[PDB]
Scaffold this active site. Structure first.
Site, PDB file in Angstrom:
ATOM      1  N   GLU A 146      39.355  56.569  56.142  1.00  0.00           N
ATOM      2  CA  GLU A 146      39.126  54.970  55.334  1.00  0.00           C
ATOM      3  C   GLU A 146      40.545  54.646  54.929  1.00  0.00           C
ATOM      4  O   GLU A 146      41.028  55.138  54.716  1.00  0.00           O
ATOM      5  CB  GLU A 146      38.081  55.244  53.477  1.00  0.00           C
ATOM      6  CG  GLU A 146      38.158  54.561  52.890  1.00  0.00           C
ATOM      7  CD  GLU A 146      38.888  55.125  51.159  1.00  0.00           C
ATOM      8  OE1 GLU A 146      37.707  56.503  51.294  1.00  0.00           O
ATOM      9  OE2 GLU A 146      37.486  54.742  50.459  1.00  0.00           O
TER      10      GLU A 146
ATOM     11  N   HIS B  90      43.503  56.561  55.180  1.00  0.00           N
ATOM     12  CA  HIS B  90      42.753  58.036  54.381  1.00  0.00           C
ATOM     13  C   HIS B  90      42.880  58.316  56.589  1.00  0.00           C
ATOM     14  O   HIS B  90      41.227  57.925  57.052  1.00  0.00           O
ATOM     15  CB  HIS B  90      42.212  57.759  53.469  1.00  0.00           C
ATOM     16  CG  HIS B  90      42.232  57.519  52.814  1.00  0.00           C
ATOM     17  ND1 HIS B  90      41.798  58.847  51.240  1.00  0.00           N
ATOM     18  CD2 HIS B  90      42.269  56.831  51.830  1.00  0.00           C
ATOM     19  CE1 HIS B  90      42.420  58.347  50.193  1.00  0.00           C
ATOM     20  NE2 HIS B  90      42.499  56.482  50.215  1.00  0.00           N
TER      21      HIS B  90
END
Ligand SMILES: *[C@@H]1O[C@H](CO)[C@@H](O[C@@H]2O[C@H](CO)[C@@H](O[C@@H]3O[C@H](CO)[C@@H](O)[C@H](O)[C@@H]3O)[C@H](O)[C@H]2NC(C)=O)[C@H](O)[C@H]1NC(C)=O
Ligand SMILES: OC[C@H]1O[C@@H](S[C@H]2[C@H](O)[C@@H](O)[C@H](S[C@H]3[C@H](O)[C@@H](O)[C@H](O)O[C@@H]3CO)O[C@@H]2CO)[C@H](O)[C@@H](O)[C@@H]1O
Ligand SMILES: OC[C@H]1O[C@@H](S[C@H]2[C@H](O)[C@@H](O)[C@H](S[C@H]3[C@H](O)[C@@H](O)[C@H](O)O[C@@H]3CO)O[C@@H]2CO)[C@H](O)[C@@H](O)[C@@H]1O
Ligand SMILES: *[C@@H]1O[C@H](CO)[C@@H](O)[C@H](O)[C@H]1NC(C)=O
Ligand SMILES: *[C@@H]1O[C@H](CO)[C@@H](O)[C@H](O)[C@H]1NC(C)=O
Ligand SMILES: [Mg+2]
Length: 434
Positions: free
Chosen positions: A208, A224
């Protein structure tokens, strides 16, 4: 999930631009689609609900497979029910919409055609957009971000998934969310426990890239990582993330390597009446630089407001310097703040490089936070009980009692966000100024 046929699904148009290195840009006629979780889910044989409130119909959904066979996602009234309006280059999301019933928030994806998400590989490119966050108080988050969802919404290898991208199916993120109704071509009814949400037995994991999580008080830029960058399915608490009793026990990085100017020591930079003045619209530029092997090694941020190019603020925390996200920054920040470096653990910059190579889908959402009241983004202290003298604790000016959904869904019911003028291209292709 099946394709419901009781209500037409018409994706609101949204134009966005592709630019050359010299700043000449051309338009792309995209569309936006509402995430499947927000939709009416009913029997393929008529109007009977498969899911209502926060519980399933166990006759229609006695197990995950049967449920997916029996249940159809239907079309959405974008403006009237969900407060989503798209006009020209602009997408507005309203926080609360009082249609036939109250709707709170939304999550949407950019489409290339009516059955495929647009995908992006931003290596050596920048993503730029204009945003109005003036209507977002403490506790709200207008998020614009990217996840490597399957471009077709999963239909090609999921026999019980006919709805696909057309109906906003296929979401995953680095929290491995278990509140999704459909994951990887099955319903998530097995193990479902009410909290309009509950947690099912499975979660939906992937890498992400949080380009933008923000309100009028604070903003954060946060990649992430993940062991596998594309969607994987996880088992209950072994998912890790926000919906687990062991946050770091999973295959994704639920924390990320974040740059929030305020958290990094500069409280004068971003906010109401500040250098980037959230009382007015501004441009957010995010650049994805690589090393000589073409792997991501730096994410830079610029703002433009009143025609002035504003470099990202320097981190002022002793031991954490610079104004960009790099391996040196992430290592230093996790050491100095004393946060577990799950970013590096799950592959850091290499993971994000691989996510871009898989192809990222653009997500535009507006939400409040039932887990932590958005305090991680905008609080004078997170955790609320922690000492603001400790580096990394303070993230904004909001009180520790702010952002409770039951409070703000009343007091901030008029809140909204507008994303506009999306541009993608080579470094320095999408912006200019004094
Ligand atoms: C998705 O979530 C479901 C739960 O809703 C997970 O199902 C569980 O899977 C595990 C591993 O297959 C099972 O654990 C074991 O059960 C067998 C007996 O059936 C036992 O012999 C093993 O030693 C082990 O303890 C568990 O029974 C099963 N539970 C249910 C209700 O089906 C599933 O693993 C999740 N999927 C993914 C990809 O994570
Ligand atoms: O009530 C609206 C809608 O809610 C879903 S469940 C939904 C949940 O209520 C909401 O708090 C989160 S917000 C989510 C955000 O969209 C995303 O951008 C961010 O990455 O993660 C945030 C926290 O998950 O989304 C949930 C779904 O993903 C109900 O199922 C639905 O019936 C209801 O209409
Ligand atoms: O993205 C949607 C997702 O957001 C979480 S909020 C989450 C945030 O993404 C993450 O960056 C931080 S990590 C945070 C850490 O928890 C804390 O211990 C440390 O001191 O500071 C770190 C940087 O803020 O955690 C946030 C809280 O989970 C929503 O809760 C989730 O529902 C949603 O799906
Ligand atoms: C559940 O679905 C069955 C089968 O269509 C239907 O008979 C029943 O009324 C439904 N109940 C609820 C509460 O949705
Ligand atoms: C683009 O602009 C920035 C900001 O002025 C500058 O520092 C950088 O060197 C430029 N990058 C390229 C590739 O020209
Ligand atoms: Mg399941």
């Amino acid at each position: 999930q099946q394709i419901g046929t009781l209500t037409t699904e018409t994706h609101p148009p949204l134009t966005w631009q592709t630019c050359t290195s010299g700043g000449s840009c051309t338009t792309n006629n995209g569309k936006v689609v509402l995430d499947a979780n927000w939709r009416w889910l009913h029997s393929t044989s008529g109007s009977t609900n498969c899911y209502t409130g926060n519980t399933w119909n166990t006759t229609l959904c006695p197990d995950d497979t049967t449920c997916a066979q029996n249940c159809a996602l239907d079309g959405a009234d974008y403006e009237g029910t969900y407060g989503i309006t798209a006009s020209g280059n602009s997408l507005r999301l309203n926080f609360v919409t009082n249609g036939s019933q109250k709707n709170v928030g939304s999550r949407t994806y950019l489409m290339k055609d009516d059955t495929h998400y647009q995908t992006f590989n931003l290596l050596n490119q920048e993503f730029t957009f204009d945003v109005d966050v003036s209507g977002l108080p403490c506790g709200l988050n207008g998020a614009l971000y990217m996840v490597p969802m399957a471009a077709d919404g999963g239909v090609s290898n999921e026999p019980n998934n006919k709805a696909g991208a057309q109906y906003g199916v296929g979401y995953c993120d680095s929290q491995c969310p278990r509140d999704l109704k459909f994951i990887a071509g099955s319903a998530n009814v097995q193990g479902w426990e009410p909290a309009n949400s509950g947690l099912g037995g499975n979660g939906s994991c992937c890498a992400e890239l949080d380009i933008w999580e923000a309100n009028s008080i604070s903003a954060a830029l946060t990649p992430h990582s993940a062991d596998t960058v594309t969607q994987t399915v996880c088992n209950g608490d072994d998912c890790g993330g926000t919906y687990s009793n062991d946050r770091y026990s999973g295959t994704t990085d639920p924390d990320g390597c974040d740059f929030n100017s305020y958290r990094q020591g500069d409280t004068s930079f971003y906010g109401p009446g500040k250098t980037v003045d959230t009382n007015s619209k501004f441009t957010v530029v995010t650049q994805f630089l690589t090393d000589s092997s073409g792997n991501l090694n730096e994410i830079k941020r610029f703002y433009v407001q009143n025609g002035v190019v504003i470099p990202n603020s320097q981190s002022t925390i002793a031991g954490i310097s610079g104004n960009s996200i790099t391996q040196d920054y992430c290592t230093a920040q996790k050491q100095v703040f004393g946060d577990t470096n799950t970013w590096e653990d799950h592959g850091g910059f290499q993971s994000m490089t691989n996510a871009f190579k898989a192809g990222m889908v653009l997500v535009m959402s507006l939400w409040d936070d039932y887990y932590a009241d958005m305090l991680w983004l905008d609080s004078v202290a997170y955790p609320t009980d922690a000492d603001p003298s400790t580096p990394g604790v303070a993230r904004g000016t909001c009180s520790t009692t702010s952002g409770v959904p039951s409070d703000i869904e009343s007091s901030a019911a008029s809140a909204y966000v507008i994303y506009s003028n999306i541009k993608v291209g080579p470094i320095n292709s999408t912006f200019s100024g004094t």
